[PDB]
Nucleic acid binder design. Structure first.
Ligand SMILES: [Mg+2]
Ligand SMILES: [Mg+2]
Ligand SMILES: [Mg+2]
Ligand SMILES: [Mg+2]
Ligand SMILES: [Mg+2]
Ligand SMILES: [Mg+2]
Ligand SMILES: [Mg+2]
Ligand SMILES: [Mg+2]
Ligand SMILES: [Mg+2]
Ligand SMILES: [Mg+2]
Ligand SMILES: [Zn+2]
Lengths: 100, 106, 107, 50, 62, 131
RNA sequence: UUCAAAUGAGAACUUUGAAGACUGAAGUGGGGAAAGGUUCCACGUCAACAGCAGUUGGACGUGGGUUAGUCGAUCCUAAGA
RNA sequence: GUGAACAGCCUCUAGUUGAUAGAAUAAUGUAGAUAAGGGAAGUCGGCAAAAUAGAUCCGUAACUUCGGGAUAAGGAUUGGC
């Protein structure tokens, strides 16, 4: 186990070329937390309760924007030159219709 | 000169979630704090106590919060909690153990 | 057919005599050819952690033996020209010596 | 140069305003023979020579 | 997506080199929406963009 | 194989062997002959100022003194301490002429050894006095 | 130089992340003078050009951008005209 | 950091990873090395290579415009603790 841990740490670390990312800035997943604590042999009842409470707190509620504009797009004629609404088009302002 | 400094650690969140042992943490501190360069030489110099949620270290011989953090991170690495639990300061000489940010699985 | 095995690959004899700037890229190609030979799949994907294991000691420091986990799985995309592909993972072990081909029980 | 004279900057402004392709409505006129800008200038092709 | 502009803006806003900014590879659309230094600051605040630590040059052997 | 070792240990650039130097130092007559050498025009220092341990001629007595106050000379003197390692040692290690090797070892331990040590001590004090 | 993902009809060459390297402060870093004149930046975007390629570009199309009593010119005189 | 040192070599901040690619390893080339014994017998010609090299100490000829020649030549040594 000690040799395996040495090999895993050697594969993880690349300290000569750059630093390791800060854990306090990264975020990780409850699945990995559960599997690691299960390997360590602790009791996951309280952590599972916390995760279930967080999941039940994060509820997705649909709205009128989701009902109306949920699948659609555009609503605006996309310009040929990527111009804003009040931006001049030197090339195409003199030709009103798209056929011409 | 030799004014007694007090350092507190709050282990309540990992203890309540059931992944930490304050008695083992305090015993590790007792066995691994070095005075004048050696372990087991804490007699009448430093004292470590724990009541199940707060671990208190009262020292008169060259103890610092950075040293306490170093020892706590050694203990967390030994118990394989370094990737999930960190040691942070709330005010001067009072610290707590916190979890790293974890997203729900859903 | 979905399957997963663990193999040992001898990169020493495959990289024998290769120019120093090309050793790690040739190890990548030899691993792809190895997976194709053992699984019958033209589509082979190497994990980035496996790429790290290959390149860990620079361009000319490839290990003699590597322990690999090769998984033949189904290609979900319809536009793909093949229905199956292989995924090659590194197995970090104490030593890559004395190990035989084994079948990993997927669960 | 960054510290340029006003005369040079005036000629530069004129060159910038001249740098364009043809307007498209020119091509639709009766008996039009102008089919491209034959005097177009680019910074990396022909130097203005002051 | 092309996040070259966002990478440059993140380096300028954080105040480090472009070699020291990490853009989350999973929040590609969210980073692509950010066209201003204000939005870049918001992304840094919520953790989509992270400042890397300096590569160590220890003096122990010296 | 490499150029440094090749051009140092070429056969034409070979040096005197340690067992030969040990035989030279073992007998008092040999030490006296090596200390009193005839004047040779082809030698450094006209054949004088000769270090017996290193088997080396010096151009001057001051050069010989600086050589004696050095680690190279100390290295050679330390090398010249024990059994000279002739072919009989390798034969005994292989299991051949073991009794002959044992007789040679006990002769070195009893008679040749201390006489060589006393000759070395007399040579050292002579060199210290004259230099 | 390598790996995975994204984008895309199409990716050795584009973007992000993961790795391996290099310039090694007399730099492959950060600014300026002469010179250039918009090449700066954004959006759109691949016919021609980038001696392979190309979704990329100092390319093509449309716009945005240079704020001074204190920084310069302006003033003074030099060789000289 | 090493080192007398803006030398060479390695590294931090910052910046690059650009120069058509892939597969094999015949002859002949371009660039770079090693070689037993002999040691210029080679060649118009020691061309080219090899050998020397930092630092400490000992020592240093002819000639001379007395200032030099001179690092003349020739020797001993160098690590770690
Ligand atoms: Mg070869
Ligand atoms: Mg270099
Ligand atoms: Mg370097
Ligand atoms: Mg081309
Ligand atoms: Mg540009
Ligand atoms: Mg343009
Ligand atoms: Mg030879
Ligand atoms: Mg001849
Ligand atoms: Mg001849
Ligand atoms: Mg001379
Ligand atoms: Zn000697």
């Amino acid at each position: 186990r000690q040799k395996t841990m040495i090999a895993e740490a050697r594969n993880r670390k690349s300290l000569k070329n750059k630093a390791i990312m800060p854990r306090s800035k990264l975020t990780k997943s409850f699945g990995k937390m559960e599997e690691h604590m299960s390997t360590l042999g602790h009791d996951m009842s309280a952590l599972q309760d916390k995760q279930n409470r967080a999941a039940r707190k994060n509820r997705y509620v649909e709205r009128g924007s989701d009902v109306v504009f949920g699948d659609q797009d555009a609503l605006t004629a996309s310009t040929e030159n990527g111009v804003k609404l009040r931006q001049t088009d030197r090339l195409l302002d003199g030709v009103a219709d798209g056929s011409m | 000169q030799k004014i007694a400094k007090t350092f507190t650690v709050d282990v309540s969140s990992p203890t309540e979630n059931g992944v930490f042992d304050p008695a083992s943490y305090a015993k590790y501190l007792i066995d691994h704090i070095k005075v004048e360069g050696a372990v087991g030489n804490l007699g009448n110099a430093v004292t470590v106590t724990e009541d199940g949620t707060v671990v208190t270290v009262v020292s008169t011989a060259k103890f610092s919060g950075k040293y306490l953090k170093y020892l706590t991170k050694k203990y967390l690495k030994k118990n394989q909690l370094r990737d999930w639990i960190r040691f942070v300061s709330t005010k001067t000489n009072e610290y707590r153990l916190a979890f790293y940010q974890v997203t729900p699985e859903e | 057919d979905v399957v997963t095995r663990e193999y040992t690959i001898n990169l020493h004899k495959r990289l024998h005599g290769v120019s120093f700037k090309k050793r790690a890229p040739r190890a990548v190609k030899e691993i792809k050819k190895f997976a194709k030979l053992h699984m019958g799949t033209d589509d082979v994907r190497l994990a980035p952690e496996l790429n790290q294991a290959i390149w860990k000691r620079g361009v000319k420091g490839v290990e003699y033996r590597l322990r690999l986990r090769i998984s033949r799985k189904r290609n979900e995309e319809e536009d793909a020209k093949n229905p199956l592909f292989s995924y090659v993972e590194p197995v970090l072990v104490a030593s890559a010596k004395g190990l035989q081909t084994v079948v990993v029980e997927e669960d | 140069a960054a510290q340029k004279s006003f005369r040079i900057k005036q000629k530069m402004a004129k060159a910038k305003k001249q740098n364009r392709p043809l307007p498209q409505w020119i091509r639709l006129r009766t008996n039009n023979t102008i089919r491209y800008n034959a005097k177009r200038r680019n910074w990396r092709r022909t130097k203005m020579n002051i | 997506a092309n996040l070259r502009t966002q990478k440059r803006l993140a380096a300028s806003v954080v105040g480090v080199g472009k070699r020291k900014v990490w853009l989350d590879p999973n929040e590609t659309s969210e980073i692509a929406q950010a066209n201003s230094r204000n939005a870049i600051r918001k992304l840094v605040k919520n953790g989509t963009i992270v400042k890397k630590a300096v590569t160590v040059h220890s003096k122990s052997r010296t | 194989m490499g150029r440094y070792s090749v051009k140092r240990y070429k056969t034409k650039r070979r040096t005197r062997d340690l067992d030969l130097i040990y035989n030279d130092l073992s007998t008092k007559e040999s030490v006296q002959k090596l200390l009193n050498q005839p004047l040779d025009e082809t030698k450094p220092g006209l054949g004088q100022h000769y270090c017996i341990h290193c088997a080396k001629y010096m151009e001057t007595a001051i050069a010989l003194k600086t050589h004696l106050k050095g680690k190279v000379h100390k290295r050679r003197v330390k090398e010249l301490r024990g059994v000279p390692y002739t072919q009989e040692v390798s034969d005994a290690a292989a299991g051949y002429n073991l009794n002959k090797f044992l007789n040679r070892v006990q002769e070195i331990t009893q008679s040749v050894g201390p006489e060589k040590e006393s000759n070395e001590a007399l040579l050292k004090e002579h060199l210290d006095s004259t230099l």
